[PDB]
Structure formats: structure tokens, C-alpha cells
Design an enzyme around this catalytic site. Structure first.
Site, PDB file in Angstrom:
ATOM      1  N   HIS A 254       0.811  -1.211   0.000  1.00  0.00           N
ATOM      2  CA  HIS A 254       0.000   0.000   0.000  1.00  0.00           C
ATOM      3  C   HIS A 254       0.847   1.265   0.000  1.00  0.00           C
ATOM      4  O   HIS A 254       0.309   2.359   0.198  1.00  0.00           O
ATOM      5  CB  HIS A 254      -0.983   0.001   1.179  1.00  0.00           C
ATOM      6  CG  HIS A 254      -0.349   0.225   2.514  1.00  0.00           C
ATOM      7  ND1 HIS A 254       0.045  -0.811   3.333  1.00  0.00           N
ATOM      8  CD2 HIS A 254      -0.067   1.366   3.188  1.00  0.00           C
ATOM      9  CE1 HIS A 254       0.557  -0.319   4.447  1.00  0.00           C
ATOM     10  NE2 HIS A 254       0.501   0.999   4.384  1.00  0.00           N
TER      11      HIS A 254
ATOM     12  N   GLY B 282       2.985   5.713   9.954  1.00  0.00           N
ATOM     13  CA  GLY B 282       4.310   5.672   9.372  1.00  0.00           C
ATOM     14  C   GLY B 282       5.162   4.507   9.819  1.00  0.00           C
ATOM     15  O   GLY B 282       6.286   4.355   9.322  1.00  0.00           O
TER      16      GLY B 282
ATOM     17  N   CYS C 286       4.475   1.360   9.295  1.00  0.00           N
ATOM     18  CA  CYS C 286       4.347   0.230   8.384  1.00  0.00           C
ATOM     19  C   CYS C 286       5.678  -0.070   7.708  1.00  0.00           C
ATOM     20  O   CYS C 286       6.410   0.836   7.304  1.00  0.00           O
ATOM     21  CB  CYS C 286       3.277   0.518   7.332  1.00  0.00           C
ATOM     22  SG  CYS C 286       1.579   0.348   7.935  1.00  0.00           S
TER      23      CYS C 286
HETATM   24  C1  LIG Z   1       0.989   2.058   7.873  1.00  0.00           C
HETATM   25  O1  LIG Z   1       2.021   2.943   8.270  1.00  0.00           O
HETATM   26  C2  LIG Z   1      -0.204   2.222   8.795  1.00  0.00           C
HETATM   27  C3  LIG Z   1       0.153   1.844  10.229  1.00  0.00           C
HETATM   28  C4  LIG Z   1      -0.962   2.187  11.214  1.00  0.00           C
HETATM   29  C5  LIG Z   1      -1.236   3.667  11.429  1.00  0.00           C
HETATM   30  C6  LIG Z   1      -1.897   3.705  12.795  1.00  0.00           C
HETATM   31  N1  LIG Z   1      -1.265   2.576  13.472  1.00  0.00           N
HETATM   32  C7  LIG Z   1      -0.735   1.692  12.631  1.00  0.00           C
HETATM   33  O2  LIG Z   1      -0.172   0.632  12.952  1.00  0.00           O
HETATM   34  N2  LIG Z   1      -1.333   1.420   8.321  1.00  0.00           N
HETATM   35  C8  LIG Z   1      -2.484   1.952   7.897  1.00  0.00           C
HETATM   36  O3  LIG Z   1      -2.770   3.138   8.055  1.00  0.00           O
HETATM   37  C9  LIG Z   1      -3.469   1.010   7.204  1.00  0.00           C
HETATM   38  C10 LIG Z   1      -3.290   1.079   5.688  1.00  0.00           C
HETATM   39  C11 LIG Z   1      -4.273   0.240   4.874  1.00  0.00           C
HETATM   40  C12 LIG Z   1      -4.036   0.428   3.384  1.00  0.00           C
HETATM   41  C13 LIG Z   1      -4.174  -1.230   5.245  1.00  0.00           C
HETATM   42  N3  LIG Z   1      -4.842   1.314   7.560  1.00  0.00           N
HETATM   43  C14 LIG Z   1      -5.254   1.202   8.835  1.00  0.00           C
HETATM   44  O4  LIG Z   1      -4.623   0.677   9.722  1.00  0.00           O
HETATM   45  O5  LIG Z   1      -6.470   1.769   8.989  1.00  0.00           O
HETATM   46  C15 LIG Z   1      -7.274   1.299  10.093  1.00  0.00           C
HETATM   47  C16 LIG Z   1      -7.630  -0.154   9.830  1.00  0.00           C
HETATM   48  C17 LIG Z   1      -8.112  -0.426   8.406  1.00  0.00           C
HETATM   49  C18 LIG Z   1      -8.873  -1.743   8.575  1.00  0.00           C
HETATM   50  C19 LIG Z   1      -9.295  -1.718  10.015  1.00  0.00           C
HETATM   51  O6  LIG Z   1      -9.969  -2.556  10.611  1.00  0.00           O
HETATM   52  N4  LIG Z   1      -8.839  -0.592  10.524  1.00  0.00           N
HETATM   53  C20 LIG Z   1      -9.498   0.183  11.556  1.00  0.00           C
HETATM   54  C21 LIG Z   1     -10.927   0.531  11.163  1.00  0.00           C
HETATM   55  C22 LIG Z   1     -11.709   1.167  12.300  1.00  0.00           C
HETATM   56  C23 LIG Z   1     -13.138   1.482  11.862  1.00  0.00           C
HETATM   57  C24 LIG Z   1     -13.150   2.394  10.651  1.00  0.00           C
HETATM   58  C25 LIG Z   1     -12.368   1.775   9.511  1.00  0.00           C
HETATM   59  C26 LIG Z   1     -10.944   1.440   9.943  1.00  0.00           C
END
Ligand SMILES: *[C@H](O)[C@H](C[C@@H]1CCNC1=O)NC(=O)[C@H](CC(C)C)NC(=O)OC[C@@H]1CCC(=O)N1CC1CCCCC1
Ligand SMILES: *[C@H](O)[C@H](C[C@@H]1CCNC1=O)NC(=O)[C@H](CC(C)C)NC(=O)OC[C@@H]1CCC(=O)N1CC1CCCCC1
Lengths: 302, 302
Positions: A43, A144, A146
Site C-alpha cells: 500500500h 508511518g 508500516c
Molecule cells: C501504515 O504505516 C499504517 C500503520 C498504522 C497507522 C496507525 N497505526 C498503525 O499501525 N497502516 C495503515 O494506516 C493502514 C493502511 C491500509 C491500506 C491497510 N490502515 C489502517 O490501519 O487503517 C485502520 C484499519 C483499516 C482496517 C481496520 O480494521 N482498521 C481500523 C478501522 C476502524 C473502523 C473504521 C475503519 C478502519
């Protein structure tokens, strides 16, 4: 009396020398630089207006070698890009001269591993977690992080097992093995997803009770026993994993003279309540220490 | 809901490059190699039949430069030896080319630091502890771990603060600052010693309650307030450290809108009992997370 049990992480220096920054447009995160390959989450190709339902196959086809910037804090020129599962396989023209002896392996629930939390390719902290039965971990990750990697160590060989991807609604985290598969049934899309139930890791609770016996705390030990099969039938109805004995648990039973079946019975009664007493200063069952943890930290047995 | 709070250690790679093995006769342990100096505990000069009441001044006078073997896993030839407090100052003829920017500093009770547990000069694991109010730590140390170092990080500068010396009767540990002083009133002799009482770190409990508010858990927050002076009088009679506010705690109060005095009152009532409820999945007060921990791990504020 202190137990001598801390959350112990591997020394991270070998892995810190493998961390880089991978940038692709308006997205930046961390990559793992081994030999001529840099692994990072896929991603990184996603525009911020597409994280919810991205087409990674079309995004990959749209990418060229000039779309990926790799930096170590040296700059690595990209000569190849491929996609395995939720992971990018970037080919760089310089092999990492600090590449350690390494394998890739998948971690099973209950097993522990060390995480190197990085941001912009810069290692910030290290910590150890246990793969929860629902294939999450109770980590510490911010925006950040990831690309941060999880690993175990066997001798001089590093077993890479986890690359951080996402944070679920409950604050826990999950990621991918280095075969591309996300742990559990999760997907690298920013949509709400079902989270499986969490469970007590029976083997890790048994290890923790053995560590208490190793520290002189053994009031819970009664001659009563529960067979492994009877405990497993009980575990299915009580949010416990089914117990599978190992040679490390057998080592704990041998050194203490306390049978696994006695501690299985102990867990059954302790689950009803600690009755005001404490075990290693805790009033609830602990499943965050593995038998290898207790074997190494208390008995010097690796 | 998981708190996002893990026991976070600094990346250890910078310090792993500074660890050596120091042998002096029938004694081996770890040393810290910075520039042309190798620091290690002074009971490396002690014959095993003298650990209880050793004469370190006579032992030092008996030592020559050929009595100290220093090895990194390179061999370092010793050209000078001196003794500051409970620490040896070995001068070697080769300066460490991996020497990081470093200072020495003493850690105060409540503050956290990272420990690199080594054996025979080989780093085995890393973990983070808080200096307990009785100047011990709840570490994980076995025979041969002496010389393991504790440190904090400020930018690229490493603040060395602890070199492991001994394990007290209760399983906790203590060591020396790099000025030679043991932490607390302990002495590097293998005789039973009085251990001061341990106490809750009030500031660390306040930080932990702020982290719960940061995670949406705030049932304990009532409009009732306790002044810092009234709480400190209370703390002296209840095995709590007296509370001293810092700019990091002020940062937590600002981001939450919860005043320190409200949480001081909360601690006073929570000390009487959690009444079956839980805070961050815990039924007892937590003082193992500092305000800097909560600031960094939850808010990305270093
Ligand atoms: C990458 O750096 C990042 C790491 C995250 C940021 C916050 N803490 C972390 O460990 N990952 C993401 O932001 C990731 C990217 C997507 C393309 C996979 N998205 C993410 O973590 O977003 C929240 C996740 C998405 C699915 C999920 O269940 N979730 C929380 C829900 C909560 C209810 C609303 C929709 C999101
Ligand atoms: C150095 O490698 C080693 C590290 C120890 C081994 C076990 N865990 C550790 O962290 N340190 C020692 O063995 C140390 C050497 C002395 C010259 C200072 N001795 C030690 O830790 O022995 C036990 C200590 C000695 C004082 C003390 O209170 N204590 C326990 C008591 C218990 C009651 C009997 C007397 C010893």
C-alpha cells in the site's frame, strides 16, 4: 519476590542495518533490505484517496522502476519491482553488505517474536509480542510505522516473520508474513473488518505457572489433575486455546516435578477466580510468556 | 481496547558494538568499550573465595596490565587500569571505532532506561525497566550478566546510566552509575544487605491514568480534586512516592483536559480498590510507564 521475567527482545542491531525508507509518490514507509531485494508493504503504491478499495494489480502495472525511491540513513537505485501478496519485492542494484544469515518463517499463535519499530527507515524502538490466537498482536505502532519487521533468532540466523501493515479497531495490530499473506483473515484495505475472538494461550499460561513454581510460588498446585483431552474440551467453551505440549514444557515439568495435568487443573480453578491471592504479583492469568521465555530467562536454557 | 502501551526499549545496535568480554583470572564478565577505556565491575578481580568481604584496594594493587584480558566477539591489549568506586577503568591500546556520541548520567527513581543483557561479551537480549524508588530494578539477569549496561537515548547521544552488579534476595537487581556509585545503599559484596521498601511511583501512575483517558477509558475521572501537597502528605503514609509534576505530565493534562489534581484524587480512591472494574485491562495501579512513554507511544511526542 520478583519473578525475573521481563518482556525480553532480541538485540536489534542486525536488523537495524537492514532498514531503509521506501517512498512511492506521496507515500512513505519502511522497507527491509536483504541482499538485492527490498521488501515493503504494497500500500505504498496507494494514493491516499484509494486506501479503502485499491486495485493493487492495476497500481503495480502503473508502477515503473523510477516510481520507487529507496533510502538508507545511501540511496538505492531500483531496477525491478514485483508483488507477492500484500508485499512488494523491490530489486535494487546494490546488495546489502550488512545482510545477516536469514530465513523467512511464519509465526504461530502463542509464539513470541521481536519487533523493530521504525519510521522513515529510522529504527525508533524494539519490543516483543506474542502472536495472539486471533492472529493479531498487542503492539505499539503509529502512523508511518508500516514496514516495521518482526523476527525471531536461532543462533546467528534471523527468522523474519512479520511486517507491520495495519491497526485494527481495538488498537491491536497485524501484518504479513514474508510470503505475502496477512496474518489471519485480514486484508490491507482501510475498511472495517471482522476481528476474530481472542483467547488465552493455554501453553503460555502453563509456562507462566511453571515460572511461579520456579520462583517458590506454588499454592495453586494441588494433586488434582486434568487430562489434556479433558482440558481441551473445557478450553473450547472457555476462550482458551487447546493445549499442545512441547519439549520446552516437558523441560519445565521435569525441573519442577509438577505435571502438566496438575497445572491444567490449576488453570481451570484459577479461571473461576484467584480468590484474592496473587501469582507473581498478578491477580489474572498471564499468557504473554512462552515456555522458551521461562526456559531461557529463569533457567538459562536456550 | 488495547492501550498501545508496550515495554519499549531503545534500539541496541549502537551499544552492542561497545560490548566486550573482560577476564581477570578465574572471573569473566562483560565490559563497555568506549574510546580507549573499557568499564566493567570491579569484582572481576575477586577470587571466588573472597566475594563476601573483598579488599578491592589490595586486589587492585595486586593487579597488573597482564592480569586483564579483553576480547570482543578482536583482542584488546591492556595498558592501564584504575578503579573508580565499584567500577574498573581499563585503558586499552585500541580506541573503539564504533564509539557513539555518549554521556554518563545517573537515573532517578521512576525514570526508565534500556538494558542490554550480555554474557561473555555477547549481547543476548534487551529490555526496559524503571528505576524503583528503592534504587533497584525488576530485571532479568543470570550468572555472568554482570557488566550489562543500561542506557537512555537523547537524539544520537547515548546516556549510559547503569552497569549491572548484583541480584538482591527478592530477585530484583541493582548496579552502578558510571561514576562508580552503586544505586541506593548497596555494596558489591556477597553478603546479605538491607533492602529499602519499594513504593508506587506516583508520577508514573498519573501517566498511566492519562494513557487510559487517551484510550477512552475514563470512568475513574471525577470532578473531585486533591492538591499536590495534600496528596504528598497522603503518599508518605501509603507507600507512594511524592508527586512532582513535569512538563511531560503537563503535556498530558493539556491534551486531555484532565487536571493532575483529579488523577491524584483518582489514585487515592483506586488505592482503596478497583471495585471489580479494570483500567487498560489491569485491576491494580500501574507505575511501570513514564510520562515520556505515554507521550511517545500514544502521541508520537518525543
Ligand atoms: C501504515 O504505516 C499504517 C500503520 C498504522 C497507522 C496507525 N497505526 C498503525 O499501525 N497502516 C495503515 O494506516 C493502514 C493502511 C491500509 C491500506 C491497510 N490502515 C489502517 O490501519 O487503517 C485502520 C484499519 C483499516 C482496517 C481496520 O480494521 N482498521 C481500523 C478501522 C476502524 C473502523 C473504521 C475503519 C478502519
Ligand atoms: C555478576 O555476574 C553477578 C550477577 C548476578 C548472578 C545472579 N543474578 C545476577 O544478576 N553478580 C553476583 O553474583 C554478585 C557479586 C558480588 C561480588 C556483588 N553477588 C550476588 O548477586 O550475590 C547475591 C547478592 C549479594 C548481596 C545480596 O543481597 N545478595 C543476595 C543475598 C541473599 C541472601 C544470602 C546472601 C546473598
Amino acid at each position: 519476590h520478583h519473578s525475573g521475567l521481563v518482556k525480553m527482545s532480541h538485540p536489534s542491531g542486525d536488523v537495524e542495518a537492514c532498514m531503509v525508507q521506501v517512498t512511492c509518490g506521496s507515500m512513505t514507509l519502511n522497507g527491509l533490505w536483504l541482499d538485492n531485494t527490498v521488501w515493503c508493504p504494497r500500500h505504498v503504491m496507494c494514493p491516499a484517496d484509494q486506501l479503502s478499495d485499491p486495485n493493487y494489480d492495476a497500481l503495480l502495472i502503473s508502477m515503473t522502476n523510477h516510481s520507487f525511491s529507496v533510502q538508507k540513513h545511501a540511496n538505492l537505485r531500483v531496477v525491478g519491482h514485483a508483488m507477492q501478496g500484500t508485499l512488494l519485492k523491490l530489486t535494487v542494484d546494490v546488495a546489502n553488505p550488512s545482510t545477516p544469515a536469514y530465513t523467512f518463517t511464519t509465526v504461530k499463535p502463542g509464539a513470541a517474536f521481536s519487533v523493530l519499530a521504525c519510521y522513515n527507515g529510522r529504527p525508533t524502538g524494539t519490543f516483543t509480542v506474542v502472536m495472539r490466537p486471533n492472529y493479531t498482536i498487542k503492539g505499539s505502532f503509529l502512523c508511518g510505522s508500516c514496514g516495521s519487521v518482526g523476527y525471531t533468532k536461532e543462533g546467528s540466523v534471523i527468522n523474519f516473520c512479520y511486517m507491520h501493515q495495519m491497526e485494527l479497531a481495538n488498537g491491536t495490530h497485524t501484518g504479513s508474513a514474508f510470503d505475502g499473506t496477512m496474518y489471519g483473515a485480514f486484508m490491507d484495505k482501510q475498511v472495517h473488518q471482522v476481528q476474530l475472538t481472542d483467547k488465552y494461550c493455554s501453553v503460555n499460561v502453563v509456562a507462566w505457572l511453571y515460572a511461579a513454581i520456579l520462583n517458590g510460588c506454588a499454592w495453586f498446585v494441588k494433586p488434582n489433575r486434568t487430562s489434556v483431552v479433558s482440558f481441551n474440551e473445557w478450553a473450547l467453551a472457555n476462550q482458551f486455546t487447546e493445549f499442545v505440549g512441547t519439549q520446552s514444557v516437558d523441560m519445565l515439568a521435569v525441573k519442577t516435578g509438577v505435571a502438566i495435568e496438575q497445572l491444567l487443573y490449576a488453570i481451570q480453578q484459577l479461571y473461576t477466580g484467584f480468590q484474592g491471592k496473587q501469582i507473581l504479583g498478578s491477580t489474572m492469568l498471564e499468557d504473554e510468556f512462552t515456555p522458551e521465555d521461562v526456559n531461557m530467562q529463569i533457567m538459562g536454557v536456550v
